[PDB]
Amino acid sequence: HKVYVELQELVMDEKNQELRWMEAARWVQLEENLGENGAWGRPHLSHLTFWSLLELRRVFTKGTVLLDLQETSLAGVANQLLDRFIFEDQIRPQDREELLRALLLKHSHAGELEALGGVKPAVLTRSGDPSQPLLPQHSSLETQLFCEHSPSGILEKIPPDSEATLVLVGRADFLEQPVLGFVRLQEAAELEAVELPVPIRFLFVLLGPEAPHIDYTQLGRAAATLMSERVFRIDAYMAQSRGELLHSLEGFLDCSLVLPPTDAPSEQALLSLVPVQRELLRRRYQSSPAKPDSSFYKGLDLNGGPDDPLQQTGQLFGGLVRDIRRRYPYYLSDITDAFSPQVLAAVIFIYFAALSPAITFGGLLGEKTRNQMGVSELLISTAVQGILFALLGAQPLLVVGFSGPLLVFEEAFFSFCETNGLEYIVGRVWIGFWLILLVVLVVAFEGSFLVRFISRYTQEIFSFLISLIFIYETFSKLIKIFQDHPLQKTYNYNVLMVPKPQGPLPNTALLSLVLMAGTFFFAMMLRKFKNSSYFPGKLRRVIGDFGVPISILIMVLVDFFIQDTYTQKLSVPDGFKVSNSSARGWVIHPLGLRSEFPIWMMFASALPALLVFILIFLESQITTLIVSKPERKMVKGSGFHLDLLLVVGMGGVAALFGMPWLSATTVRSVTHANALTVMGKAQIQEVKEQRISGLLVAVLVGLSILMEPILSRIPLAVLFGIFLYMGVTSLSGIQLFDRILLLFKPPKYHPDVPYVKRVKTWRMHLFTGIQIICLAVLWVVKSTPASLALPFVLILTVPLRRVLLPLIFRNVELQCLDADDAKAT
């Protein structure tokens, strides 16, 4: 079912001029070559050339064939072959004496290469001494591509009981035309030429002088490839004369697929020949007792259709079990795939990216609600809900954390409770209970299929407004830092800085601005250098993967060297203590903390629970939609019901303990996904999916309280450059940003995307203007004191695309612009 093929050439040794046989390629269902170093290249398929096949056919149509030869040693075979050459007027009688000595010569394998110092091509002459070829020579193709352990694999691949074939090539100047000799032994016998213990059955001998359009190495490769095929081997095993071998060779040539040179080859056009090749293979096996091996091993007998992540199912809890069965079989791969240093770099980046907003929001919430909930509670909740969500989640690329609308709701609830005279930390328990009940009810009826109705319109609007608000807030923080310490002519000294610096300071604002600009510039420069060609690829990519930590370390050291100037630093709480121990505990009694809780509040607490559920559900589902789009080479499936269930349940349980509930964050998740992306020379080659990164980030956030000495030396202004870098980078994939950019270019320089060719310019501009008006309305209502009515407006965007726009544009334009898929439109 498989055999061994060995190809040898007549060469000369560099040390002292002599002739000998050296092996050059081996065949076990695949071709392996060896270079001048002496180490075999990687196995590959065989790709012959037109000239080799043509000359092989020409020389084989008249070559002599000896069948059922009764010989055991090489000398008897060579004698009979030379006698048959003489009989058929192939060679002159004065040439046998030299050829016999040439064939009966020592054979040296690869293991003896370094002892001699290498070999060079040689040409036999009438006298018998080597000489250089007259015609020009060229470097070999296979040894240049594939050549630039193995014995165990070689001994394993060969079946225990099989025969082997030997092919010998070499040039002789005392000849007229090339000669081919094919001899099959009557009974397989051992030979001194091959060191392997496999017996030898077939023998090829290819001789001749130099001539144009004849390369003997390629011709020997073609002969070995012909012998390697099963059909020709079976035909030779049953052939009784040369006619059967000629017919088999004609059949082999008939089923060959030759492709001509082109100008701009592509991997897409080359894949349009897939059926044709298949057909040819079938024809090759049409009239043979054998059968193909890969009859249906090239395509999956399944469908890429009805298998959709979200779909209505006739049974309860269908989505949950479907997501579990789709994702969990990849758990070992998720664990293993996290052994690259890129995972470590992403962990380091996301650690700061998730730690800073948590601290800021915790401080603001502590100063807003009279320290009912502070920083330590938020840190602990983030750590726990990150560890558990990474261990038991379906999409481990999401980052959980506190957000803005949640803070707005907390402020409104605290104000309402203060006005009505009720407690604050107790009602949150009942809100969490109602959240648990509501999420159980929703997941039980798989009511997540509504996510299908959200098109690209709302996703782009939401992402653009989030990124823009992020950048605005960063610049607002910088301007606040400027406002705290103005640029004056006089500054009072001996100011007290123990709680916080009172009054202006000399060189704070400009230093902070300089540090931010330097961090941003260094990060962008390293990002550009990642795609450069200025170093070895491995070291270049290793350096470029660690750009953000390198820039952070550089700027931290620069700030550390300066002594007298003051810059704000990161601060974390001293220990795992509750923010206010006077009126709070680790566990909250639902019945009442200091006074009894009214029954009407317990029965009416469902109303804010619905709003919280809407906010969390909408944000998480839109984030999952954006992160897991088909364009970003996401191979493993992403679940929708399991993530929502986990998040809302975890929120309720945390609300029981007094810690706040969280939700998926868009910018952090997008940054985490972009960090774990391997790009090809551009094209997104792959995305590394694993669960280690999130778990490590959560553990580090939890343990941050134990790292005061390290975190106390990191200035706050450095992270602003990182925030700006994140905000700018997270704006690349947005399509509305591109359509806004095209508002300024003249129509001569527009790209070749479908939505430019299919529709006219002033319709694209009207579309963009409508979307910008929607964005402006969203911003205005966000600034309006009626902020809690913000999410509803967002979903009100869905009917607009469904009703109003079809009354203004046409179906082709709307389908080309609002495309569900990026590549396909």
Of 87, 296, 534, 586, which lies in the binding site for ligand CLR, with binding defined by CB under 6 A? 534
Among its own copies, ligand CLR, ligand NAG, none, the one that 47 touches (CB under a kind-dependent 5 to 8 A) is its own copies
| Cα distance between residue 634 and residue 625, in whole Å | 12
* Binding piece for ligand NAG, criterion CB under 6 A, among 50-58, 411-419, 534-542, 577-585: 577-585
The set of residues, in sequence order, having a beta carbon less than 8 Å from that of 355 and lying 6+ positions away, is 700, 701, 704
**Residue of 723, 351, 360 lying closest to 571 (CA atoms):** 360
Q: Which residue type is seen at 249?
A: L
234-253 footprint of its own copies as x/- string (CB under 8 A) = ------------------xx
Residue closer to its own copies by CB (options 145, 773) is 145
Rg (CA), the chain: 38
CB 582, min distance to ligand NAG, A: 5
Contact between 462 and ligand LMT per CB under 6 A? yes
CB atoms within 10 A of CB 558: 15
Contact between 360 and ligand LMT per CB under 6 A? no
Of 141, 525, 679, 773, which lies in the binding site for ligand CLR, with binding defined by CB under 6 A? 525
591-630 footprint of ligand LMT as x/- string (CB under 6 A) = ------------------------x--xx-----------
Angle between the 274-284 and 242-254 helix axes, to the nearest 10 degrees? 160
* Binding piece for ligand LMT, criterion CB under 6 A, among 271-279, 310-318, 404-412, 634-642: 404-412
Residue 33: in which H helix or E strand, if any?
strand 31-33
Of 70, 490, 683, 783, which lies in the binding site for its own copies, with binding defined by CB under 8 A? 490
Among ligand CLR, ligand LMT, its own copies, none, the one that 339 touches (CB under a kind-dependent 5 to 8 A) is none
Touching ligand CLR, residues 323-342 (CB under 6 A): none
Contact between 134 and its own copies per CB under 8 A? no
CB 563, min distance to its own copies, A: 8
In total, the chain counts a number of residues equal to 825
**Residue of 84, 81, 63, 85 lying closest to 249 (CA atoms):** 63
CB 517, min distance to ligand CLR, A: 16
* Binding piece for ligand NAG, criterion CB under 6 A, among 10-18, 50-58, 568-576, 578-586: 578-586
Of 47, 370, 452, 528, which lies in the binding site for ligand CLR, with binding defined by CB under 6 A? 528
Residue closer to its own copies by CB (options 510, 766) is 510
SS3 letters for 96-108?
A: HHHHHHHHCCCEE
Q: Which residue type is seen at 748?
A: K
Evaluate whether 254 touches 280 at the Cβ level (below 8 Å): no
510-539 footprint of its own copies as x/- string (CB under 8 A) = xx-xx--x---------------xxxxx--
| Cα distance between residue 9 and residue 24, in whole Å | 7
Contact between 532 and ligand CLR per CB under 6 A? yes
* Token couple for 110: 């690869």
Contact between 422 and ligand CLR per CB under 6 A? no
Residue closer to its own copies by CB (options 115, 258) is 258
CB 592, min distance to ligand NAG, A: 15
Contact between 370 and ligand NAG per CB under 6 A? yes
Of 49, 455, 568, 580, which lies in the binding site for ligand NAG, with binding defined by CB under 6 A? 580
Residue 123: in which H helix or E strand, if any?
strand 123-124
Q: DSSP assignment of 398-411, as one string?
A: --EE--HHHHHHHH
CB 201, min distance to its own copies, A: 22
Strands (E), 611-673: 663-664
Of 471, 687, 788, 805, which lies in the binding site for ligand LMT, with binding defined by CB under 6 A? 471
CB 143, min distance to ligand LMT, A: 50
Touching its own copies, residues 553-572 (CB under 8 A): 562, 564-565
| Cα distance between residue 807 and residue 661, in whole Å | 43
The set of residues, in sequence order, having a beta carbon less than 8 Å from that of 126 and lying 6+ positions away, is 98, 173, 174
Q: How many CA atoms lie within 13 A of 779 on its CB side?
A: 15
Strand partners, 69: 185
Of 782, 814, 819, 825, which lies in the binding site for ligand LMT, with binding defined by CB under 6 A? 782
Evaluate whether 389 touches 646 at the Cβ level (below 8 Å): yes
Size of the site for ligand NAG (CB under 6 A): 5
**Residue of 731, 738, 729 lying closest to 527 (CA atoms):** 729
CB 491, min distance to ligand LMT, A: 14
Angle between the 456-484 and 666-675 helix axes, to the nearest 10 degrees? 100
Is residue 206 helix, strand or coil? strand
Contact between 743 and ligand CLR per CB under 6 A? no
Is residue 577 helix, strand or coil? coil
Contact between 819 and ligand LMT per CB under 6 A? no
Among ligand NAG, ligand LMT, ligand CLR, none, the one that 370 touches (CB under a kind-dependent 5 to 8 A) is ligand NAG
Strand partners, 9: 22, 169
Evaluate whether 625 touches 615 at the Cβ level (below 8 Å): no
SS3 letters for 649-705?
A: HHHHHHHHHCCCCCEECHHHHHHHHHHCEEEECCEEEEECCCCHHHHHHHHHHHHHH
Of 70, 152, 287, 294, which lies in the binding site for its own copies, with binding defined by CB under 8 A? 294
Evaluate whether 541 touches 530 at the Cβ level (below 8 Å): yes
Among ligand CLR, its own copies, ligand LMT, none, the one that 529 touches (CB under a kind-dependent 5 to 8 A) is ligand CLR
Among its own copies, ligand CLR, ligand NAG, none, the one that 575 touches (CB under a kind-dependent 5 to 8 A) is none
Size of the site for its own copies (CB under 8 A): 77
Residue closer to ligand NAG by CB (options 249, 373) is 373
Among ligand LMT, ligand CLR, ligand NAG, none, the one that 603 touches (CB under a kind-dependent 5 to 8 A) is none
Residue closer to ligand CLR by CB (options 554, 601) is 554
Residue closer to ligand CLR by CB (options 469, 542) is 542
- Residue 569, Ramachandran bin (φ over 0: left; ψ between -120 and 50: alpha; else beta): beta
Q: Tokens 């303990």 sit at which residue?
A: 657
Burial 200-212 (b: 16+ CB within 10 A, else e): bbbbbbbbbeeee
Of 517, 554, 611, 772, which lies in the binding site for ligand LMT, with binding defined by CB under 6 A? 517
Evaluate whether 677 touches 365 at the Cβ level (below 8 Å): no
Evaluate whether 814 touches 805 at the Cβ level (below 8 Å): yes
* Binding piece for ligand CLR, criterion CB under 6 A, among 161-169, 334-342, 433-441, 522-530: 522-530
Contact between 278 and its own copies per CB under 8 A? yes
- Residue 199, Ramachandran bin (φ over 0: left; ψ between -120 and 50: alpha; else beta): beta
Contact between 407 and ligand LMT per CB under 6 A? yes
Q: How many CA atoms lie within 13 A of 365 on its CB side?
A: 30
CB 794, min distance to ligand LMT, A: 5
| Cα distance between residue 802 and residue 595, in whole Å | 52
Of 507, 768, 787, 815, which lies in the binding site for its own copies, with binding defined by CB under 8 A? 507
The set of residues, in sequence order, having a beta carbon less than 8 Å from that of 303 and lying 6+ positions away, is none
Contact between 445 and ligand LMT per CB under 6 A? no
Breaks in the chain after residues (C–N exceeding 2.5 Å): 148, 681
Q: DSSP assignment of 286-325, as one string?
A: TTSS---S-SS-SS-SS-SSS--SS---SSTTHHHHHHHH
* Binding piece for its own copies, criterion CB under 8 A, among 238-246, 287-295, 615-623, 633-641: 287-295
Write out the residues near ligand LMT by the rule CB under 6 A: 364, 404-405, 407-408, 462, 465-466, 468-469, 471-472, 475-476, 479-480, 483, 486-487, 514, 517-518, 521, 558, 561-562, 615, 618-619, 782, 787, 790-791, 794
Binding stretches for ligand CLR (CB under 6 A): 525-526, 528-529, 532, 534, 543
